Design a protein around this ligand. Sequence first.
Ligand SMILES: *CC[C@H]1/C(=C/c2[nH]c(/C=C3N=C(/C=C4\NC(=O)C(CC)=C4C)C(C)=C\3CCC(=O)O)c(CCC(=O)O)c2C)NC(=O)[C@@H]1C
Ligand SMILES: *CC[C@H]1/C(=C/c2[nH]c(/C=C3N=C(/C=C4\NC(=O)C(CC)=C4C)C(C)=C\3CCC(=O)O)c(CCC(=O)O)c2C)NC(=O)[C@@H]1C
Ligand SMILES: *C[C@@H](*)[C@H]1/C(=C/c2[nH]c(/C=C3N=C(/C=C4\NC(=O)C(CC)=C4C)C(C)=C\3CCC(=O)O)c(CCC(=O)O)c2C)NC(=O)[C@@H]1C
Ligand SMILES: *C[C@@H](*)[C@H]1/C(=C/c2[nH]c(/C=C3N=C(/C=C4\NC(=O)C(CC)=C4C)C(C)=C\3CCC(=O)O)c(CCC(=O)O)c2C)NC(=O)[C@@H]1C
Ligand SMILES: *[C@H](C)[C@H]1/C(=C/C2=NC(=C\c3[nH]c(C[C@H]4NC(=O)C(C=C)=C4C)c(C)c3CCC(=O)O)/C(CCC(=O)O)=C2C)NC(=O)[C@@H]1C
Ligand SMILES: *[C@H](C)[C@H]1/C(=C/C2=NC(=C\c3[nH]c(C[C@H]4NC(=O)C(C=C)=C4C)c(C)c3CCC(=O)O)/C(CCC(=O)O)=C2C)NC(=O)[C@@H]1C
Ligand SMILES: *[C@H](C)[C@H]1/C(=C/C2=NC(=C\c3[nH]c(C[C@H]4NC(=O)C(C=C)=C4C)c(C)c3CCC(=O)O)/C(CCC(=O)O)=C2C)NC(=O)[C@@H]1C
Ligand SMILES: *[C@H](C)[C@H]1/C(=C/c2[nH]c(/C=C3N=C(/C=C4\NC(=O)C(CC)=C4C)C(C)=C\3CCC(=O)O)c(CCC(=O)O)c2C)NC(=O)[C@@H]1C
Ligand SMILES: *[C@H](C)[C@H]1/C(=C/c2[nH]c(/C=C3N=C(/C=C4\NC(=O)C(CC)=C4C)C(C)=C\3CCC(=O)O)c(CCC(=O)O)c2C)NC(=O)[C@@H]1C
Ligand SMILES: *[C@H](C)[C@H]1/C(=C/c2[nH]c(/C=C3N=C(/C=C4\NC(=O)C(CC)=C4C)C(C)=C\3CCC(=O)O)c(CCC(=O)O)c2C)NC(=O)[C@@H]1C
Ligand SMILES: *[C@H](C)[C@H]1/C(=C/c2[nH]c(/C=C3N=C(/C=C4\NC(=O)C(CC)=C4C)C(C)=C\3CCC(=O)O)c(CCC(=O)O)c2C)NC(=O)[C@@H]1C
Lengths: 172, 172, 172, 162, 162, 162, 162, 162, 231
Amino acid sequence: MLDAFAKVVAQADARGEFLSNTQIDALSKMVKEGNQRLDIVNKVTSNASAIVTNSARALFAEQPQLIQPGGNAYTSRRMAACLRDMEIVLRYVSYAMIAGDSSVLDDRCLNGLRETYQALGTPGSSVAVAIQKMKDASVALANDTTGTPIGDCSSLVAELAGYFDRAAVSVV
Amino acid sequence: MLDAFAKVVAQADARGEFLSNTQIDALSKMVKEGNQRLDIVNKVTSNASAIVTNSARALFAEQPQLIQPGGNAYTSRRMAACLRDMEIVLRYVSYAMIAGDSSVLDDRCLNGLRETYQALGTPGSSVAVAIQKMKDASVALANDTTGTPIGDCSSLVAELAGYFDRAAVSVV
Amino acid sequence: MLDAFAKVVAQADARGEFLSNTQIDALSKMVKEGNQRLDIVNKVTSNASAIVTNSARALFAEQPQLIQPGGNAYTSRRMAACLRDMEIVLRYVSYAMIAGDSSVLDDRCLNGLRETYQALGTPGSSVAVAIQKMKDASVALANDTTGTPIGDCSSLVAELAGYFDRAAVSVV
Amino acid sequence: MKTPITEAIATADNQGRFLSNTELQAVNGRYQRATASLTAAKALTGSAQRLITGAAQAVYNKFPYTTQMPGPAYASSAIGKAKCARDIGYYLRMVTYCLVVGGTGPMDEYLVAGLEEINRSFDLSPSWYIEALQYIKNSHGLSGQVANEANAYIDYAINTLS
Amino acid sequence: MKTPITEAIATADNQGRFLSNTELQAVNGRYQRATASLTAAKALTGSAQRLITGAAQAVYNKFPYTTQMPGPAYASSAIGKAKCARDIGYYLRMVTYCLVVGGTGPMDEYLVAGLEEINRSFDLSPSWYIEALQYIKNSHGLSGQVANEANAYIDYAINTLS
Amino acid sequence: MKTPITEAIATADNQGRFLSNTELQAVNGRYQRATASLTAAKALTGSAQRLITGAAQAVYNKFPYTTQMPGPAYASSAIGKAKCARDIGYYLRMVTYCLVVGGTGPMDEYLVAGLEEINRSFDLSPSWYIEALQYIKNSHGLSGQVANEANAYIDYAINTLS
Amino acid sequence: MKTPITEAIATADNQGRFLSNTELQAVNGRYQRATASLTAAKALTGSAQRLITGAAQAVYNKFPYTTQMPGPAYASSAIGKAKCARDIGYYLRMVTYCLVVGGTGPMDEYLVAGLEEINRSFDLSPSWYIEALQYIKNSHGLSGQVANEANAYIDYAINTLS
Amino acid sequence: MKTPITEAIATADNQGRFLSNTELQAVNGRYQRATASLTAAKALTGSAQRLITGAAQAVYNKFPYTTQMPGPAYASSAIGKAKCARDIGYYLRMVTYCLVVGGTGPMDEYLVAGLEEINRSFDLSPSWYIEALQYIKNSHGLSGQVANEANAYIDYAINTLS
Amino acid sequence: SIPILKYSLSTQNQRVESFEVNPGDEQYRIYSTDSLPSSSEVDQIIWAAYRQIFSEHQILKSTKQPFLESQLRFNQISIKDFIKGLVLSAPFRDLNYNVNNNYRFVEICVQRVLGRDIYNEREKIAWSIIIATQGLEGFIDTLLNTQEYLSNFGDSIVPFQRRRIIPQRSKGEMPFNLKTPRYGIEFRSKLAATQFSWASPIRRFRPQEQQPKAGDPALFLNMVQEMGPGL
Ligand SMILES: *CC[C@H]1/C(=C/c2[nH]c(/C=C3N=C(/C=C4\NC(=O)C(CC)=C4C)C(C)=C\3CCC(=O)O)c(CCC(=O)O)c2C)NC(=O)[C@@H]1C
Ligand SMILES: *CC[C@H]1/C(=C/c2[nH]c(/C=C3N=C(/C=C4\NC(=O)C(CC)=C4C)C(C)=C\3CCC(=O)O)c(CCC(=O)O)c2C)NC(=O)[C@@H]1C
Ligand SMILES: *C[C@@H](*)[C@H]1/C(=C/c2[nH]c(/C=C3N=C(/C=C4\NC(=O)C(CC)=C4C)C(C)=C\3CCC(=O)O)c(CCC(=O)O)c2C)NC(=O)[C@@H]1C
Ligand SMILES: *C[C@@H](*)[C@H]1/C(=C/c2[nH]c(/C=C3N=C(/C=C4\NC(=O)C(CC)=C4C)C(C)=C\3CCC(=O)O)c(CCC(=O)O)c2C)NC(=O)[C@@H]1C
Ligand SMILES: *[C@H](C)[C@H]1/C(=C/C2=NC(=C\c3[nH]c(C[C@H]4NC(=O)C(C=C)=C4C)c(C)c3CCC(=O)O)/C(CCC(=O)O)=C2C)NC(=O)[C@@H]1C
Ligand SMILES: *[C@H](C)[C@H]1/C(=C/C2=NC(=C\c3[nH]c(C[C@H]4NC(=O)C(C=C)=C4C)c(C)c3CCC(=O)O)/C(CCC(=O)O)=C2C)NC(=O)[C@@H]1C
Ligand SMILES: *[C@H](C)[C@H]1/C(=C/C2=NC(=C\c3[nH]c(C[C@H]4NC(=O)C(C=C)=C4C)c(C)c3CCC(=O)O)/C(CCC(=O)O)=C2C)NC(=O)[C@@H]1C
Ligand SMILES: *[C@H](C)[C@H]1/C(=C/c2[nH]c(/C=C3N=C(/C=C4\NC(=O)C(CC)=C4C)C(C)=C\3CCC(=O)O)c(CCC(=O)O)c2C)NC(=O)[C@@H]1C
Ligand SMILES: *[C@H](C)[C@H]1/C(=C/c2[nH]c(/C=C3N=C(/C=C4\NC(=O)C(CC)=C4C)C(C)=C\3CCC(=O)O)c(CCC(=O)O)c2C)NC(=O)[C@@H]1C
Ligand SMILES: *[C@H](C)[C@H]1/C(=C/c2[nH]c(/C=C3N=C(/C=C4\NC(=O)C(CC)=C4C)C(C)=C\3CCC(=O)O)c(CCC(=O)O)c2C)NC(=O)[C@@H]1C
Ligand SMILES: *[C@H](C)[C@H]1/C(=C/c2[nH]c(/C=C3N=C(/C=C4\NC(=O)C(CC)=C4C)C(C)=C\3CCC(=O)O)c(CCC(=O)O)c2C)NC(=O)[C@@H]1C
């Protein structure tokens, strides 16, 4: 897989070029916000079980036919596979937040997941609702200042919200 | 896999229902046929090599191109693999007879068989003639009264010959 | 795999025939020129490293866009894989020279190779140029008269040229 | 499914064999037991709502904090009491499915598989459901070999929660 | 050996399971049918010498070249006739071992595993042994479900030779 | 097929190697045995129907029950006699196939794979085909190394039949 | 590649686990080091044209036979001299790629993997490149912990050639 | 090793088979080629005092830096000269073992296995050994198939060095 | 030194957990020598390994390896060496390796040794060069020494098709012997003694497949065999 820094080298090797001065200074900008990026992923993985079990509880109150008899999350194994998949999606999103790009999320989490859900009868549009519930439960927690020095890291939160949006549109 | 008592449980659960007294009374009509169903698979198992070789001998007497040089059952490794196929199909029709429905036959035997024979160049319409000759060898054996008490098992003969029909339309 | 002798047998078994007297006599003509067939694969094998590395050097002189950045032969791993693809193909041509027919060349080397290069992004027309550069390099060695009694091998050399030509049209 | 029928087909198909008398005797033992095992399912179904609303009240007696404490995991609201009697009826319905099938098939697929992961996430204590199954084990009213069949699946459910 | 009891343990040990009602019903089907198969093994044991000498004579009427052709494979000498009635007794003894155990376990271990290399090497014909076993099926004198149990293991030995 | 050409490619192929001088000597040994090996394959090709009908008659003299016993396995019909002489033509054609490639390639692939399985199914004794091959071994009339090459593959079919 | 970030994700993903503080302490050590690695990668890039021609002239003094001996593998022609400085620039470029990523990730896929087959086939001696890399380590002009990061990936490329 | 006698045994041993006619012709191709092999082994053995010190000087004439450049890898000392002549004697002795055995068996297990790591570590170039091997192929002074067999193992050693 | 080339994973059943304590009838029968089996039960390990590597149609008498079996019965080789010895056997090279190319032979040996399907098409491309440059003996060693083999099967368990059926369902993925036969649509054409590639159903003037209708007296035939007793 690639991270953000190794993505720039892969662009520069294919043109056979040394890196420029502006490409160096763009890379030293990602180093400067490294402590604010590490502080986000720490905020998300520390509450990772509560993101999943509360975004699921809001989903089954909004779409109550998923836990009625015949519903896709009705039995104890179908209920536990639903909480498994939300935890898998949230895990690879946390991986893509320290790397800087969605290379591990596309290859190791999303590849073939839409076709897996069609073959199962799992409603793929309902999985997208539960990922967007995990999106703003994580974004609202990443914007919480209790424990961090005060400052503006809103560009990083708009990047984390794009990994959740990437997995939400790649599941339906 | 499902048996005949597990097929009614899966229909009932899919709507979150108990089983009514009318449904229980139809499952104890299936139990009372229990010893006649066990006599039918005993007559098929005990004569299983005469079902296969008498009906393979009949298959090449009336389609003698299959064992001529250039045929598909020529060159005795392909002759032995041809008799293996008939014992395999007879094995799973025997499994579907004690189970009471054809779900172990459907996905462990017949699933992908028509597309297997097209990749080998095996005439799949002649495999269906091979299954149809084991069909009435097995039916004439199950209508035969030797070793059995007096009574009735004629709705079970019509059921055993229906698994041979399902196996024969799935291969053409 | 088949040689020239078992090619005739497998064709005769599909008709149910013995071999005719003109088929045994055409087989014993292969035995008569068997020493000259072995002298050809003695010249090719003994210089096999120099056939690959001289024709690969001439391929990049005349196709200098393969080893420019972005080209298919630009990295250490993509360039050494270009060298071993030539050594695989040169190896399976010599397997088709002592066998007498191109049955080991087609089954083990050329089957499904055009579609593999299309999936990798390898320019398949340039692989044909490298095979043709190895063709005349080993024909020039086959026509060398050093360490041999002087005779006519011109029908054998025109057969070796047909094995490289078959490999070059089976890859684009 | 853990039916005695599908367990017999599986041991024959493991070694690529026809069904001998080893497997026909396993099927025959299901039919000899299916008489007592089907009158138990008829009597538990007919007393379903009596046993469900009784067993819910026995949990609220032994665990009275489950009706007082606020939060989504407890039966302190009108929705929490509807979802609590839903779960008693789930455990009762799976027992009756095992009695009409023979063997612990439906309980393993529909109930036990994944139960430990659910009861940890939604903070549902498994001691509540043990108390609810011990009520049904004492109040179904059956006797003889019909209660002996019924209690073998109440006890199988208690061993998974315990 | 493959018995109905060791095939219920092995399917429960594969699942990491205690002995459920799926497995208790299967062992109970063995105990129900064991009354009919323990009298078949008692009635085949007590009339064994009538069955061995009869079944060896039935091969000699049907294939009379086996008494006339010279060579070590045939029953033409007195040595080769006692080796025939030895072998008929081996097949009849394994059938009684399968009736007391239930299931084709003793002859799967003692007889059929490696049998084709014996018949190929010493030039013995498996149709001599089918004719001997078809005599014992027609002449054991059993009736009811006692003959049903005995004939189900005669036909297993024929199906491995056929 | 198992051929001294193709068993020489398939030792350099299993290591990813070019054909060294180890494998060119194996091809050379085939080329200087092929002269005596190819004259046997056309001396048996021309003398086929003398050797076929005589060998089937040699089975009928040694085992005269095969012309008398009724049933599908025996040559007591006009159909069964046609299938007997078809079989001797299969065995003789595979011997001429092995002589023109060197070594037991075609009869390993076309005849002996699955041969034991179909003899037992269709009740065909392999002692019949041994006697038919002892006729061909004595009556091909070849001499020198032309008889050594011929008898090398007649004895191979006898060794795997018994 | 072999970034420390991807080498921390790969351990958490193998266990199927979230990112703990074991991984965030690893990535923090990358960020506390990258202020010296990115000053070394910019200082080598801005002095590259002095470093390439100086290292290419140094191997002509150490091994003068390269500029005299004929053959395509030597720098005696203008074609061979342009391909020699091309190779020095390929080694310096992967060094500055490894500094901005951290760890020997880019030069593994792009320079080291398959290097031994290139030097064997085209007959390029790896001791020519070791003499060129020892020039850059001597006179890149850096000092402090900036020069420690540059010599860490110079000596990695020397260790693969040696 | 990799004699054609041991590669015919190990072929038949990996198939669980007696030595068929496919293997005996591979053995007889060794015996036909043997008298052109055992005379080249006899001729190179006595002429080794000239062919080693003649080939050592052929390297110093093409690569004269190996006598002047200081260091342990070059033959600029009496220790390095005597170890350079030792290396050519390894290559010549391995050729006479491959002629006696027949095929590239002895020099595969004794010489070429793991050689690329030795040259890369001790900094010594394989192009020095190729110029020594092309000398012996130009000056062994044989003709006929005695030279064509001897040159087939010199050319195997050159193809492993490049 | 030419590492293997990188391919992407795909979503499969075996990459993710089944929360299944107490498995059912679709649990797929571990055959292990860690349970100390007797002679009758080590025959069942051997037949299960033949069925997994070969087909059911290649368990002929001429295919069985009698000396590889006796080294397993004496505790000289493990089950990982039995499985390796069946792939490098002479029947497997003759009936399977010679009638496939390098890309379809990889997906046979991934499905039958690793017990899972291929991830994508590039995984076939990545492994088919291990065959062409090192042989079958080098390809099966680098496939049995992956962490996918040593974690699932170890060295004393026969492989099986991992996670074929989902615990609620009755219709699972196709079995790997019906999905991938001995040879495919190439080598079918004329390289495997074949004509015409298809066949219409057999016609006949006695129809043999007549469906019964609603007044036919065989639908009431039930108690025709015998009347019930009583009064
Ligand atoms: C709340 C979530 C929704 C939902 C989920 C659901 N999914 C499944 C089944 C599977 N999920 C996967 C997913 C993955 N496999 C992987 O390897 C990866 C990472 C690359 C992922 C994300 C797979 C393979 C399955 C099938 C196999 C299995 O179930 O173990 C189920 C299973 C039950 C069923 O019958 O579908 C559920 C319930 N379903 C919903 O209703 C929610 C909207
Ligand atoms: C008389 C029968 C006809 C016939 C059969 C024939 N079949 C084959 C090959 C295969 N058959 C199967 C079928 C199954 N495999 C399974 O696992 C199951 C369920 C348990 C079934 C039903 C498969 C997978 C194959 C190919 C794999 C293999 O053979 O290894 C062959 C041989 C093909 C070959 O040349 O290799 C024959 C001859 N052929 C006929 O002509 C008859 C009409
Ligand atoms: C019906 C008699 C026909 C007959 C018999 C015959 N058999 C043999 C030789 C052997 N039979 C066996 C068989 C078994 N041994 C076992 O341990 C078991 C399982 C318990 C079986 C089924 C074996 C091993 C032999 C050879 C060793 C021996 O017992 O002496 C022979 C002698 C053959 C010989 O060459 O000595 C005969 C004559 N043959 C007939 O003609 C009768 C029709
Ligand atoms: C210091 C110069 C010495 C020298 C150089 C020389 N090199 C070549 C040919 C090649 N060098 C490479 C090396 C790489 N290619 C890569 O992509 C990478 C990683 C990015 C490396 C390290 C390759 C592949 C070739 C062959 C193709 C090519 O580039 O032309 C040559 C020409 C040799 C030939 O036979 O063509 C020379 C002369 N040689 C010297 O003598 C100098 C001391
Ligand atoms: C933005 C979404 C947040 C926020 C982030 C900031 N964090 C700042 C400093 C800082 N953060 C951490 C946590 C993190 N870094 C680590 O190394 C580790 C684990 C080892 C973790 C969990 C640390 C240690 C530091 C100290 C470094 C420093 O003092 O700078 C920070 C300060 C400025 C900056 O780094 O650019 C910010 C803005 N703060 C917010 O207000 C929101 C909620
Ligand atoms: C139906 C196609 C036959 C036929 C069948 C009947 N069988 C009857 C009773 C019966 N069958 C068995 C054997 C069976 N049970 C087993 O447990 C096993 C395996 C070990 C087998 C093979 C037994 C033991 C019994 C006795 C049961 C009893 O005594 O009731 C039967 C009885 C009448 C009825 O049950 O109503 C019938 C009709 N008879 C036929 O005529 C056809 C040919
Ligand atoms: C054809 C492209 C050549 C050529 C070849 C001839 N070679 C003749 C005989 C011969 N060939 C070899 C080499 C080969 N045979 C082997 O047995 C082995 C090793 C196992 C090898 C590598 C040998 C050793 C011999 C000598 C045997 C003999 O003298 O027959 C040959 C016939 C001889 C003749 O015609 O006098 C021919 C024509 N001759 C050519 O002019 C081109 C260059
Ligand atoms: C060199 C002349 C040309 C060239 C080569 C090139 N090849 C590859 C990759 C592969 N080549 C194969 C080839 C075969 N596989 C087989 O199994 C057989 C016998 C049937 C052959 C001939 C395979 C499988 C691959 C992929 C495996 C791998 O990635 O190593 C590459 C790709 C290297 C890469 O990193 O992508 C290249 C560059 N390409 C050219 O430009 C020359 C024209
Ligand atoms: C009643 C005895 C006690 C109680 C019940 C309660 N349960 C829930 C929530 C769930 N219960 C289940 C259980 C099952 N689902 C199944 O499909 C099956 C097998 C067929 C079982 C056993 C599940 C999955 C949930 C969560 C989803 C749902 O709402 O059904 C709640 C709500 C908890 C929440 O956070 O939503 C309550 C209140 N709790 C008590 O206090 C009673 C003592
Ligand atoms: C003649 C020596 C004796 C004899 C022959 C006989 N054979 C059969 C039937 C079959 N024989 C074969 C054998 C092969 N088929 C092959 O393709 C090959 C490899 C080329 C061999 C060795 C097979 C498959 C059959 C059955 C199908 C067929 O009809 O060919 C019979 C008929 C048996 C039947 O049940 O129909 C007979 C009579 N039997 C004798 O009595 C002669 C002594
Ligand atoms: C001589 C023509 C050129 C040369 C030779 C040289 N070689 C070495 C050192 C070694 N050579 C070997 C090679 C082999 N050892 C084996 O056992 C075999 C197979 C039988 C081979 C091919 C090894 C292992 C060494 C190192 C140990 C040793 O001293 O023998 C040196 C010394 C290098 C050192 O650092 O010790 C020299 C000088 N070098 C030249 O300059 C000549 C052109």
